[PDB]
Each structure stands twice: as structure tokens, then as C-alpha cells.
Amino acid sequence: KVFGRCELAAAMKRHGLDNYRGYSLGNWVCAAKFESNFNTQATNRNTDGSTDYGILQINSRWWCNDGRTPGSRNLCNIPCSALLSSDITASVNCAKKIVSDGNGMNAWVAWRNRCKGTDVQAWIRGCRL
């Protein structure tokens, strides 16, 4: 599924992402914009052979099982495919564990490089939330 901006903002809020670990909804929407362009089916193969899955491009090295990332963990206790669902529940639950890991949203390199320190509230501007 390709979400609308305000549509994704609403889904993330509904699943308690807004101000989760102190990160406003605009941070989450910005990260999703640059990770996936709001496409739940987005995948990206990394050089290390791990893969990134879904609206927030969660990686198989730590967070999900894809059966093809040697020596990897599955800390969200999910098949990586669950992260490609039109239903963002698995992505949001897993993102809550990731953003709790110690480095906050710096875990998403694209959030650090493209969202961090920017006017992120622009990403929920005009949305009925």
C-alpha cells in the first residue's frame, strides 16, 4: 500500500507512535517519507546481505527473520514479510523497540541525515489528527 501523508500520520497516531520516546508524529512521517516514500512494500538490499522492509525500512540484521541474513537476530519476533503489510501494526510495534534501543531515531540513518533538526511538523501540516 502507498499511504497518503495525512493517512499515514493518522495510522501512526492510532498505533501510539506520536511522541513515542519523545519523537513527535512529524519525525515518524518524515522518516517514513525518506525510507519508503510511504510504500509498505518498499525493500532495499544492503551490501552486508541484510534487507530493509516496509514503511520504515526495518533491517533483517537485528529486527525480523527473512531466513537469508546469516548470524542475524529477530528481536521483533516477526517474519520481515509482516513489515510489508497494508496494516502498519507490525512496523509500528517493531519501530517502538528500535527507537528504544539507545540511539533514538538515529537508528534510521535517513532520519538523521534528512529529518533530524528540520521543521518536521511540516509533515503533519493540514492533517486532521
CA dihedral 16, 119, 124, 38 (to 10 degrees): -80
Residue whose CB is less far from Na ion, 41 or 65: 65
**Main-chain dihedrals φ then ψ at residue 88, nearest 5 degrees:** -80, 0
Contact 12, 127 (CB under 8 A): no
Among residues 7, 76, 75, the alpha carbon closest in space to that of 40 is found at 7
Is 119 designated active site?
Answer: no
Is 18 designated active site?
Answer: no
Minimum Å gap between C-beta 96 and Na ion is 18
Among residues 15, 37, 35, 9, the alpha carbon closest in space to that of 105 is found at 35
Minimum Å gap between C-beta 119 and Na ion is 35
Site for Na ion in 4-63 (CB under 5 A): 60
Minimum Å gap between C-beta 60 and Na ion is 4
48 is in an annotated binding site: no
93-110 CB burial, b ≥16 within 10 A, e <16: bbbeebbeeeebbebbeb
Residue whose CB is less far from Na ion, 27 or 60: 60
Q: Give the one residue of 27, 57, 69, 91 binding Na ion; rule: CB under 5 A.
A: 69
**Binding segment toward Na ion, per CB under 5 A, in 66-74, 85-93, 95-103, 119-127:** 66-74
Residue list, annotated binding site for substrate: 101
Residues that bind Na ion (CB under 5 A): 60, 65, 69, 72, 74
